[PDB]
């Protein structure tokens, strides 16, 4: 005889093509113990467990144990996966977390955007470039801004790389004849650094 069901707090899970992700949901019951956590699409039934895409994974530690879902020490569900590079972008998936208390109460699924962040969350897939924000590097002084030579293009690409070590090693850095930088990430998405922040002349 428990009357309330476990409550969930999740978040805004933005994931990126080519990159791994890892988010956590916090679960608390009035009983202080939660015995089961399921993450699923709205389709199904009560015991449905279908979740798509298949690359979305979840895990929970310390299930079914007194006080593992208290306000002082919330139950935490790890939501993680690896987005493949061939995933469409424009794309988001609305999902549900269901938790179970010892008396059997299950989190109620409510199909409404007003629940996003709680037991309902959105997993938004974005392009790789949306994960990084390349930093303005060393200014590279060149002879002429309208005609960067090959070596000046290579020097600007090496300086951008030196300022941005977080950026995927496989990302390609190219510089044009007027000095604009193009960062092509592994999923072929693109970031571009203006020529006036990385290149200068004395004319
Ligand atoms: C109203 C209802 O029970 N229908 C379910 C659909 O959900 C409803 O339409 C959605 C477009 C969306 O507006 C939602 O708010 C509304 O409840 C459900 O569609 C799926 O809903 C997801 C979240 O609940 C999400 O928005 C998905 O985009 C949307 O496709 C359909 C589809 O599921 S299916 O039958 O399994 O394929 O289920 C209806 O029951
Ligand atoms: C990019 C895409 O196709 N996702 C659409 C999903 C999927 O149809 C189902 O989630 C897959 O089962 O439906 C809805 C949703 O989930 O929020 C909106 C979204 O536009
Ligand atoms: Na659906
Ligand atoms: Na970026």
3-class secondary structure, 187: coil
Q: Which residues contact 81 (CB under 8 A, 6 or more apart)?
A: 15, 20, 21, 55, 56, 57
CA distance 12 to 14: 6
Q: For residues 123-144, b (16+ Cβ closer than 10 Å) or e, as one string? A: bbbbbbbbbbebeebeebebee
- Hey, whose CA ends up nearest to atom 12 of ligand 1? 111
CA–centroid distance, residue 132 to ligand 4 (Å): 4
Instruction: Kindly compute the dihedral angle of the four CA atoms of residues 34, 72, 22, 37, in this order, to the nearest 10 degrees.
Output: 10
Cα angle for residues 101, 105, 110 (degrees, 5° grid): 120
Q: Is the CB of 91 under 6 A from ligand 2?
A: yes
Q: Can you list the alpha helix ranges (DSSP code H) found in 17-142?
A: none
What are the backbone angles phi and psi of residue 75, rounded to the nearest 5°?
A: -75, 135
- Determined by X-ray
Strands across the sheet with 92-100, in order?
12-16, 120-126, 92-100, 36-40
Resolution as reported, in Å: 2.5
In 3D, which of 9, 106, 103 has the Cα closest to residue 48? 106
DSSP string, 3-26: -SPPEEE--EEEEETTSEEEEEEE
């Amino acid at each position: 005889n428990d009357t309330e069901a476990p409550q969930v707090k999740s978040g805004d899970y933005v994931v990126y093509r080519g990159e791994s992700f890892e988010y956590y949901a916090e679960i608390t019951d009035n009983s202080g113990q939660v015995n089961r956590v399921v993450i699923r699409n709205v389709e199904g039934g009560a015991n449905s467990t279908y979740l798509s895409p298949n690359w979305v994974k979840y895990s929970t530690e310390n299930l079914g144990r007194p006080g593992n879902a208290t306000v002082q020490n919330p139950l935490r569900t790890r939501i993680f996966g690896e987005v493949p590079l061939n995933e469409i972008v424009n794309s988001y998936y609305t999902r549900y977390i269901v938790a179970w208390d010892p008396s059997g109460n299950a989190t109620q699924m409510v199909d409404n955007a007003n629940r996003n962040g709680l037991e309902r969350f959105v997993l938004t897939v974005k392009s790789q470039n949306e994960k990084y924000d390349p930093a303005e590097s060393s200014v590279t002084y060149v002879n002429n801004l309208s005609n960067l030579s090959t070596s000046e293009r290579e020097a600007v690409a090496a300086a951008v790389r030196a300022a941005n070590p977080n950026i995927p090693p496989t990302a390609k850095i190219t510089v044009s004849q007027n000095g604009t930088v193009t960062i092509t990430y592994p999923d072929k998405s693109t970031d571009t650094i203006p020529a006036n922040r990385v290149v200068k002349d004395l004319q």
